[PDB]
Write an enzyme that holds these catalytic residues in place. Structure first.
Site, short mmCIF file in Angstrom:
data_model
loop_
_atom_site.label_atom_id
_atom_site.label_comp_id
_atom_site.label_asym_id
_atom_site.label_seq_id
_atom_site.Cartn_x
_atom_site.Cartn_y
_atom_site.Cartn_z
CG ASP A 37 47.86 95.92 51.34
OD1 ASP A 37 48.05 95.12 50.35
OD2 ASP A 37 48.57 95.91 52.47
CB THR A 38 44.64 93.23 46.39
OG1 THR A 38 45.49 94.15 45.96
CG2 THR A 38 43.41 93.94 46.42
N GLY A 39 47.62 92.94 48.35
CA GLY A 39 48.70 92.15 48.54
C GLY A 39 48.84 91.66 49.81
C1 LIG Z 1 52.19 97.10 54.16
C2 LIG Z 1 51.75 97.82 52.82
C3 LIG Z 1 51.34 99.24 53.05
C4 LIG Z 1 52.65 97.96 51.63
N1 LIG Z 1 53.47 96.62 51.30
C5 LIG Z 1 52.37 96.13 50.31
C6 LIG Z 1 51.59 95.00 50.90
O1 LIG Z 1 50.66 94.39 49.93
C7 LIG Z 1 52.71 93.72 51.42
C8 LIG Z 1 53.05 92.90 50.02
C9 LIG Z 1 53.64 91.65 50.62
C10 LIG Z 1 53.27 90.58 50.86
C11 LIG Z 1 53.88 89.27 51.21
C12 LIG Z 1 55.41 89.48 51.46
C13 LIG Z 1 55.83 90.81 51.34
C14 LIG Z 1 54.99 91.88 50.95
N2 LIG Z 1 51.74 92.82 52.32
C15 LIG Z 1 52.22 92.53 53.66
O2 LIG Z 1 53.13 93.08 54.05
C16 LIG Z 1 51.34 91.64 54.47
C17 LIG Z 1 51.98 90.73 55.28
N3 LIG Z 1 51.54 89.29 54.80
C18 LIG Z 1 52.01 88.14 55.46
C19 LIG Z 1 52.87 87.62 55.16
C20 LIG Z 1 53.34 86.32 55.77
C21 LIG Z 1 52.45 85.93 56.72
C22 LIG Z 1 51.45 86.55 57.12
C23 LIG Z 1 51.17 87.69 56.60
O3 LIG Z 1 50.09 88.63 56.75
C24 LIG Z 1 50.69 89.38 53.55
O4 LIG Z 1 50.07 88.73 53.32
O5 LIG Z 1 50.53 90.77 53.31
S1 LIG Z 1 54.88 96.46 50.77
O6 LIG Z 1 55.08 95.18 50.36
O7 LIG Z 1 55.82 96.68 52.06
C25 LIG Z 1 55.33 97.71 49.97
C26 LIG Z 1 55.02 97.63 48.26
C27 LIG Z 1 55.45 98.49 47.44
C28 LIG Z 1 56.03 99.76 47.89
C29 LIG Z 1 56.10 100.07 49.28
C30 LIG Z 1 55.79 98.75 50.08
O8 LIG Z 1 56.68 101.17 49.55
C31 LIG Z 1 56.61 101.95 48.10
O9 LIG Z 1 56.29 100.71 47.33
#
Ligand SMILES: CC(C)CN(C[C@@H](O)[C@H](Cc1ccccc1)NC(=O)[C@@H]1CN(c2ccccc2O)C(=O)O1)S(=O)(=O)c1ccc2c(c1)OCO2
Lengths: 99, 99
Positions: B25-27
């Protein structure tokens, strides 16, 4: 290009006529953009991640340019904290993970 | 390996002597695993995702083998929808995005 992951893989995208910064996100099935008033038909959807679900608007066949590479497909619009380029568009611009 | 993105980049990991499936998960800044037991000390932390914030347990300096490549780093344990390998460990195994 090759993008290392020391920092968030943010890149410039173009949609409608707006330039935005977005995550190249291999963990996202779908592309999710921060709220914007795009023209055209849409459908409601809910997508889930850490923290729960958000409500989004699904727009189909929207052209997007990602680092000068053309793409066209489904974009979800809603109250996401970050612009997310998902696998549906990453495949279109030829993006792979490598190690 | 080179991993294309027409399917979710799911890999087998080995942690605490147990095999799990996790999403590259690069996001994600941080590696977040579903509820599990890990030995040693942990610290309460909070992280934010697309749907809001959750509480997690931060375990530091945890060895984890990802697709046969060794990492030792921070692992967060809590109510993530799926096991995710974030950039803190992707960088350790030499992962980049390419297109
Ligand atoms: C959790 C994964 C399985 C899915 N996510 C993508 C992630 O890459 C998400 C993308 C993302 C990133 C940041 C904010 C919101 C979303 N990352 C994170 O949740 C973690 C939290 N975080 C993070 C944030 C703050 C402090 C510490 C942390 O670790 C961090 O750096 O990454 S998503 O954003 O919820 C998502 C995207 C497209 C989709 C979907 C779900 O269903 C259908 O289509």
């Amino acid at each position: 290009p090759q993008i290392t992951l020391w920092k968030r893989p943010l890149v410039t995208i173009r949609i409608g006529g707006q330039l935005k910064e977005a995550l190249l996100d291999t963990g996202a099935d779908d592309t999710v953009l921060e709220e914007m008033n795009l023209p055209g038909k849409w459908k409601p959807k809910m997508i889930g991640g850490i923290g729960g679900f958000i409500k989004v608007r699904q727009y189909d066949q929207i052209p997007i340019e990602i680092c000068g590479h053309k793409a066209i497909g489904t974009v979800l619009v809603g109250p996401t904290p970050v612009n997310i380029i998902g696998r549906n568009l990453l495949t279109q611009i030829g993006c792979t993970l490598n190690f």
